[PDB]
């Protein structure tokens, strides 16, 4: 009676209490103090209220399961519809509205039609923080902001991940490739699954480009989910000396203006020899030139370095595969890899000429 | 897109259950037919507290102020502080944080700053001794409300450090198919910026009402001296009844004001407590909301808790209607099979809740 009254939701709650016989106010409703005084002058109404480990865990969970059964043994449309509903092995029809045309048009019964129920978390989007790994049999290394198709829960979706490292647990700063044989972190805009769920990732899902190699590229688990990530890429500002004394030097071009040097005063720099230093004051007439002080006398063949950090953003890109809405259901094509784009529009790969290593030979070091 | 509610009732419970469930809601007609219509300042600052606690949740107040749009986000916690207004004490803002408190990335270390007590709200001793043990046996183990200083109304000036530091996955399934035997009955009588004899007058009034029941009565006494007393005179009394074999508790509090006799207030809170014992069964009339909220966000099992006839009310069933309105779950009230009293046993099958914000 009372449950039907509670969940019959076209009648007022005081009408439920009336035909059975507001929460900003925290403390509940009491009588008048005089009525309560004459009511509780007596006391006798409430005087009777006053006065192995593995098998143990399995026993606790089977105790909960028998509690589940013996409390399910109740009203038939209560159990079998609304208090739990359709346990397992129930044969159901399930109707979806606004299913696309292409499914019904191109429905080929070879390809299975699987459906899975999303949790409250898995309908949310945002940055998923994983730790992943180039799969040991995938040949080529993976690159940040190259798409790969993830299989994260029920969904398969192509995303743009960016591989990070917490370099001795200080930053979470941005790599440019995945490592060769171990795990890195990663962050991709996608549907937020729960933490500790595993996933695969694939470069190429089609069959025209299926090649001869191994097709699954990345493996990993999900570490954390969030609405925002704060990851950085290192930028150094390089400048060269042009007037050197003992223990101090005038540094030429890492800044364009004395306002910029004023913005950066007191910062610690270093040469490539590891000589630590500090910038002290902007010089007046040559504009981006400043005066720095070092540990000792630096040389004219050095480069000073201001290690700073620039924030980088994940790219909010997400397309699910929708392979069953195609006329071929293989041959799904998404965003291409960067080498594929360069091969398509014939751009040469970017080569900084002074980034290439050489064979340095030391001259012998003699002093006066 | 939005689950729609009407009126400014149960406002904190609606925003709290929307944050738990992750469902976008609208609350329409916030006192629209009124002389100063719209949201009030204390519930606007509660929205600011929700934006402090969560991250990525967008709240969208209208022009007229009479409808709010809450699209929730991830509970992240962190350390914060909240300078809540004089319209409501710190209990009005620390009560709805005890639901969101164990389900965040980083542990709750917030300190609220304002009035400590009110007639129609939760106190420090209320929050602590009543509402922390039901969480303590629903699954959390490290939760603490500290008073650094307390401020009686109207000027207040008291700070309260809510720290929860057990980030559980989900609350356990409750099984309370008994009425817990009350082992002791204790309490705390506090007074700030007044004479220390008022506390003993309150204690003597409460215990002369309590003296005829054959249990053991113990009321602790604190006067607050110095900067810890706050900016205003005040005094109040909070009794709990303590079932020690399981840990259950039933509380009742109030505060005195300008013209109030302390023996009168002590005996009033004592009789109000005994009536809560009468109208209580394994919970209190005010511990019952978050008890059944933790039962409904437990595991995907059946959890059952005994309640009595008089705990059913318009507040309790409007709570149940809001629960079913947000995440589509029903309670099943089965009666006990013995007939010297009218007690139901509410079985709730909890939704499949986990906290997905805590990093693994």
């Amino acid at each position: 009676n009372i449950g039907k009254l509670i969940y019959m939701d076209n009648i007022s709650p005081e009408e439920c209490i009336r035909r059975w016989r507001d929460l900003e106010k925290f403390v509940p409703y009491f009588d008048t103090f005089e009525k309560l005084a004459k009511k509780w002058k007596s006391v006798d109404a409430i005087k009777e209220r006053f006065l192995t480990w593995y098998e143990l865990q399995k026993a606790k969970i089977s105790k909960q399961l028998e509690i589940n059964n013996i409390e399910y043994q109740e009203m038939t449309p209560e159990q079998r519809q609304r208090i739990e509903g359709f346990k397992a092995g129930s044969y159901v029809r399930i109707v979806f509205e606004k299913v696309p045309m292409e499914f019904v048009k191109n429905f080929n019964p070879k390809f299975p039609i699987v459906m899975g129920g999303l949790l409250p978390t898995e309908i949310k989007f945002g940055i998923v923080k994983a730790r992943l790994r180039r799969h040991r049999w995938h040949k080529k290394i993976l690159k940040t902001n190259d798409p790969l198709v993830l299989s994260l829960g029920w969904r398969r979706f192509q995303t743009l991940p960016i591989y990070t490292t917490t370099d001795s647990r200080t930053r979470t700063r941005m790599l440019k490739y995945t490592p060769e044989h171990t795990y890195c972190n990663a962050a991709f805009y996608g549907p937020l699954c729960s933490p500790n769920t595993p996933f695969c990732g694939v470069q190429i899902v089609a069959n025209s480009d299926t090649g001869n190699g191994f097709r699954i590229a990345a493996t990993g688990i999900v570490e954390e989910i969030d609405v925002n990530i704060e990851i950085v890429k290192k930028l150094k500002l390089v400048g060269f000396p042009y007037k050197i004394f003992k223990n101090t030097a005038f540094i030429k071009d890492m800044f364009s203006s004395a306002m910029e040097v004023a913005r950066f005063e007191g910062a610690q720099i270093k040469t490539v020899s590891g000589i630590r230093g500090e910038i002290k004051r902007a010089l007046s007439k040559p504009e981006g030139h400043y005066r720095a002080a070092f540990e000792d006398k630096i040389l004219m063949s050095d480069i000073v370095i201001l290690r700073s950090w620039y924030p980088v953003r994940v790219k909010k890109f997400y397309n699910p595969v929708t392979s069953l809405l195609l006329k071929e259901k293989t041959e799904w094509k998404g965003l291409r890899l960067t080498g594929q784009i360069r091969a398509a529009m014939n751009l040469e790969t970017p080569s900084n000429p002074d980034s290439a290593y050489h064979k340095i030979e030391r001259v012998e070091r003699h002093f006066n | 897109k939005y689950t729609t509610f009407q009126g400014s009732q149960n406002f904190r419970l609606r925003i709290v259950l929307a944050t738990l469930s992750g469902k976008p809601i609208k609350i329409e007609k916030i006192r629209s037919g009124d002389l100063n219509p719209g949201l009030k300042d204390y519930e606007v600052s509660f929205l600011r507290l929700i934006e402090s606690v969560t991250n990525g949740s967008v709240i969208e107040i209208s022009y007229t102020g009479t409808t709010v749009i809450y699209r929730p986000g991830i509970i992240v916690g962190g350390a914060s502080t909240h300078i809540c207004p004089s319209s409501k004490p710190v209990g009005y803002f620390v009560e709805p944080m005890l639901y969101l408190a164990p389900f965040s990335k980083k542990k709750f270390s917030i300190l609220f700053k304002g009035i400590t007590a009110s007639h129609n709200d939760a106190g420090i001793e209320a929050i602590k001794w009543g509402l922390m043990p039901v969480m303590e046996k629903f699954g959390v183990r490290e939760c603490a409300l500290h008073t650094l200083k307390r401020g009686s109304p109207p000027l207040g000036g008291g700070e309260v450090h809510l720290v929860v530091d057990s980030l559980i996955a989900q609350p356990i399934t409750m099984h309370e198919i008994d009425r817990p035997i009350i082992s002791s009955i204790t309490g705390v009588a506090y007074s700030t910026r007044v004479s220390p004899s008022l506390v003993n007058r309150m204690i003597d009034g409460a215990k002369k009402v309590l003296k005829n029941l054959q249990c053991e009565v113990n009321i602790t006494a604190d006067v607050w001296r110095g900067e810890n007393s706050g900016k205003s005179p005040g005094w109040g009394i909070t009794l709990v009844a303590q079932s020690k074999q399981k840990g259950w508790s039933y509380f009742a509090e109030d505060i005195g004001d300008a013209g109030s006799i302390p023996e009168e207030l002590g005996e009033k809170v004592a009789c109000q407590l005994l009536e809560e014992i009468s109208k209580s069964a394994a919970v209190g009339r005010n511990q019952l909301p978050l008890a059944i909220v933790y039962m409904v966000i437990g595991k995907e099992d059946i959890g059952r808790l005994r309640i009595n006839k008089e705990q059913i009310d318009e507040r309790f069933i409007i709570l149940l209607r809001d629960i079913k309105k947000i995440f589509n779950t029903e309670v099943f009230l089965k009666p006990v099979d013995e007939a010297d009293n009218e007690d139901m046993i509410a079985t709730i099958k909890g939704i499949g809740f986990t906290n997905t914000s805590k990093k693994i």
Binding site: - | V44, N55, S62
Partner: peptide, 14 residues
């Protein structure tokens, strides 16, 4: 420092 890693905000149109 309070703004630095937020993503929400109340939208007070009053």
């Amino acid at each position: 420092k309070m703004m630095k890693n937020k993503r929400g905000g109340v939208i007070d149109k009053r």
